[PDB]
């Protein structure tokens, strides 16, 4: 049971306490004496239960294990290879929508460096397309089928965590030791992501010019944000410097294109307790340890995962 409060800050009433200064007991090395220690958590990690008393969001879904701080989550290039008697054929066509015959095929033993980047809404540090931007879809007419967009020129993105966190090293047991988030050194600021609006301008123009090749030429194409649901789907879920960001993409997909110098900043939230991929069974949940210092990362936006609405015979757009 966590006895939590707001963090030490005086701001206007239009600022919900994202961070909570929590206090609780803990078992020390010995299984006798407890431990009145405090930590700092994000609001997404905790949930009230009926002085505000909370719990962790996952206590009622699954067990939990912390990710060791020694290991890292850095996407590295993986080349996939096949055994003897087999080979990997690589289409060498510049314009190829993935399905059908490939005029210029070559063969290879191991593919190129494919970084396993985990994101949801925007593909990052990917492979750029050649010449014209690429659209790929299993069935364009079916509004239930995703539309994967691969970019020709990369869009520069900059995500930062402006909070010089502190790592508290609690001793929970004779071997284990937990890494809580100590006090913040500096200002109470929010994580955000920047997108140069010029490059994004031209990129959106170049994708709509390719869309018009499939939906009639003199038509209007509108962009709206996600519909709703989980945070993992409604935000550009990803990991950067170890913290798991969840950014609002409502400022990127609110446009409308007819037949014919600043950065767009995005409010990015952070979550430490994530349970993707079901949790390896029905039990395990991972706590992303707190990271000391301000994290800044520059990435490429190299693709999108779009979905179209089911208007049927609704409009020309």
């Amino acid at each position, epitope marked *: 049971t966590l006895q939590c409060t707001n963090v030490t800050n005086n*701001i206007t009433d239009d600022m919900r306490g994202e961070l909570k200064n929590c206090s609780f007991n803990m078992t020390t090395e010995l299984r006798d004496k407890k431990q009145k220690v405090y930590s700092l958590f994000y609001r997404l990690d905790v949930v009230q239960i009926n002085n505000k008393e909370y719990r962790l969001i996952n206590c009622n879904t699954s067990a939990i294990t912390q990710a060791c701080p020694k290991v890292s989550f850095e996407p590295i290039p993986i080349h996939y290879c096949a055994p003897a008697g087999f080979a990997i054929l690589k289409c060498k066509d510049k314009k190829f929508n993935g399905t059908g015959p490939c005029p210029s095929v070559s063969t290879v033993q191991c593919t190129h460096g494919i970084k396993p980047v985990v994101s949801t809404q925007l593909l990052l540090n990917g492979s750029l397309a050649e010449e014209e931007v690429m659209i790929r879809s299993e069935n364009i007419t079916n509004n239930a089928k995703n539309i994967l967009v691969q970019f020709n020129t990369p869009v520069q993105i900059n995500c930062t965590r402006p909070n010089n966190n502190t790592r508290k090293s609690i001793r929970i047991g004779p071997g284990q030791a937990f890494y809580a988030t100590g006090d913040i050194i500096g200002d109470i600021r929010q994580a955000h992501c920047n997108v140069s609006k010029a490059t994004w301008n031209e990129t959106l123009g170049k994708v709509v010019k390719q869309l018009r090749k499939h939906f009639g030429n003199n038509t209007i194409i509108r962009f709206a944000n996600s519909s709703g649901g989980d945070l993992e789907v409604t935000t550009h879920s990803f990991n950067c410097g170890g913290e798991f960001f969840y950014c609002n993409t409502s400022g990127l997909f609110n446009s409308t294109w007819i037949s014919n110098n600043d950065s767009i900043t995005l409010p990015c939230r952070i979550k430490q307790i994530i349970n993707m991929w079901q949790g390896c069974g029905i039990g395990q949940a991972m706590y992303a340890p707190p990271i000391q210092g301000v994290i800044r990362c520059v990435s490429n936006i190299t693709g999108l995962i779009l979905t179209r609405d089911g208007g049927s015979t609704n409009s020309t757009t």
Partner: antibody
Amino acid sequence: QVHLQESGPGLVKPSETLSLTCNVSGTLVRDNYWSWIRQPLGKQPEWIGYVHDSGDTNYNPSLKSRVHLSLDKSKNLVSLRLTGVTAADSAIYYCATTKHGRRIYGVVAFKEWFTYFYMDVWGKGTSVTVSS
Amino acid sequence: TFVSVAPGQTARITCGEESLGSRSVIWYQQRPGQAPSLIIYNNNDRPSGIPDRFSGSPGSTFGTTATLTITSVEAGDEADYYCHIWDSRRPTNWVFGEGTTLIVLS
């Protein structure tokens, strides 16, 4: 030139209504912020509150439910009212102009900033002793 | 609090709580029997009429107290000194910090 003059009764009985006026000379009250600052004897000056045209005014949370400030545009002066006085209000009340500023520490758009005020041109001040 | 420094040197005055965020300390000078006068209006920015080198510690360091350096200390600067701390993490301070009296020796 900017001359500020504080003027009031000087003696007010307990649980009464103090009323003060700051005669300003050299500039209009519509174009400036006006703050009042008392200072007990041997203590640190205590900021009371600020007032400006267009209804922008704020008080002290510790003295929230007792003070009322005003500006006389016609007669070009500042006005202060303090109801329900006690022995703690005896101090030297100053009338000063106030200049505003914004310090931005974050990215602005996130409301990551705050406004800070500072009084530059003081008045000579008036004395107020609470006694029966 | 009292600070003793010889004339023609550097004096240093501490005022206010420790810093918690980005701060914009405002410094004031109270001559004996007079009204406070402004010296520094944005944590090391002097207005017109204040001589050098009257300097304050930059409002970007987190975890230190506001310090006021007064180079070439004279007998005329002997006065009380108050501070208005503007901390991004703390509500508005309606009470100036406890003043510091400067003592010019000899």
